[PDB]
Symmetry: D2
Subunit: 95 residues, 4 copies
Amino acid sequence: MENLLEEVEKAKVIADEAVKLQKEIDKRCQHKIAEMVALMEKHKHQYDKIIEERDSELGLYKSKEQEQSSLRASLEIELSNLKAELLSVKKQLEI
Amino acid sequence: MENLLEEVEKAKVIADEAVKLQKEIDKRCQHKIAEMVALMEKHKHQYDKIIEERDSELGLYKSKEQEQSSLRASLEIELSNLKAELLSVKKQLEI
Amino acid sequence: MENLLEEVEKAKVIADEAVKLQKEIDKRCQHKIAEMVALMEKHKHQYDKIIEERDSELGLYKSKEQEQSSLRASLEIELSNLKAELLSVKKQLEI
Amino acid sequence: MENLLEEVEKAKVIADEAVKLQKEIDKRCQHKIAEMVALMEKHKHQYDKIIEERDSELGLYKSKEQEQSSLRASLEIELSNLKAELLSVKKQLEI
């Protein structure tokens, strides 16, 4: 009759060990998901930082490219004015 | 005297070709930056999607883990009640 | 006649300033590309680390899930053996 | 005496339902980990693609920047040669 009592005790112990082991498995999987979510968050914030910086970057880039284009315009006008004054002196000498 | 005129023309042509080549280089670098920014944006949005989904995930997970724990509680109480009634029958038989 | 000399000097100065400014622009764009490439490399290596770890993870997970399943099997067999011995005692008492 | 039989049956049913629910939870967590691993893999491969392309990019960039520098050198030499021939003509005229 202690047969049944011992068998119910084994049922209890088996159930307990199975439940604790499944809790361990579950927890480990949850922690993996947590750490991957955190890594993704970190990367996402870094990309946000870069994309927010690029607007100020473009403002500065626009200022500099405008100055660059103005310089090219000046250089072209100057080589043209020079070629013109040379065409003038050449004919003054043709006299 | 056409020496100077031709030399100023070469200056013009060299300047023009250098300016167009530097524009090509500049544009290519800008397009690389654009495409990398776009890739980063896509990844960032995907991470946002995942992290926003995980909250609903956790709501569902909580409901299911609560049901699970309630079931374990029921199983423990039942094996205990069973062992107790067996301890009762065993003594009733000891008579 | 110093007109032309001064004008050629201005051409030289304009060309020099334009070239240095375009070098600055170019360099800044190259450095942006560099830093973004480095960030991508860092992220890529981190993902490599995670994906290489997950194989060992799965080995451990398999060991634990096998133990879990064996425990469930034991619990089922035990509750069945118990119900059977109870069906036996019940009839022994029906006598 | 059917009390114990019914109670063992309830233990069996509770255990079965708890085990199936924990399997569902476990599976859902594993599938989340799978899908996140796959997303990370996709991103990692894309970064690999970009970083492998940038080497050919740099080869082309080097060719173009070398041509650019050669052009600047030509422009400088030409404006210098021009200023020199002008300094020559100016003195020939000073006579």
